[PDB]
């Protein structure tokens, strides 16, 4: 009695205002990265922070 599905006009709708890239930040999402690499990486970066806080004289 009706019709079921069509992908007609769906491209036109999408392209009118849209198709857009996700912008790519520097320092990306460090989440779902190996937990023990993270656990360490924190202590590495804290170490580098202390080493430049020592260098500042």
Partner 1 sequence: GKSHGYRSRTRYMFQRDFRKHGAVHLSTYLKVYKVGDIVDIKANGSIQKGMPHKFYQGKTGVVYNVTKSSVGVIINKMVGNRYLEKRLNLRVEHIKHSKCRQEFLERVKANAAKRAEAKAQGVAVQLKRQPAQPRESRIVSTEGNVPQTLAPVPYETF
> Is position 57 an interface residue for RNA (rule: CB under 7 A)?
no
Residue 22 burial by Cβ neighbours in a 10 Å radius (0-12, 13-18, 19+): exposed
Residue number with CB closer to partner 1 (41 or 46): 41
Segment interacting with partner 1 (CB under 8 A) among 1-9, 19-27, 43-51: 19-27
> Is position 42 an interface residue for partner 1 (rule: CB under 8 A)?
no
Question: Which letter does DSSP use for residue 32 in this model?
Answer: S
- DSSP element (H, E) containing 41: helix 35-55
Chain residues in the site for RNA (CB under 7 A)? 1-13, 16, 20, 23-32, 34-52, 55
């Amino acid at each position: 009695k009706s019709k079921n599905h069509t992908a007609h006009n769906q491209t036109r709708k999408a392209h009118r205002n849209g198709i857009k890239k996700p912008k790519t930040y520097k320092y990306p999402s460090l989440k779902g990265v190996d937990p023990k690499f993270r656990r360490n990486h924190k202590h590495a970066l804290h170490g580098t922070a202390k080493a430049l806080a020592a260098a500042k004289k």
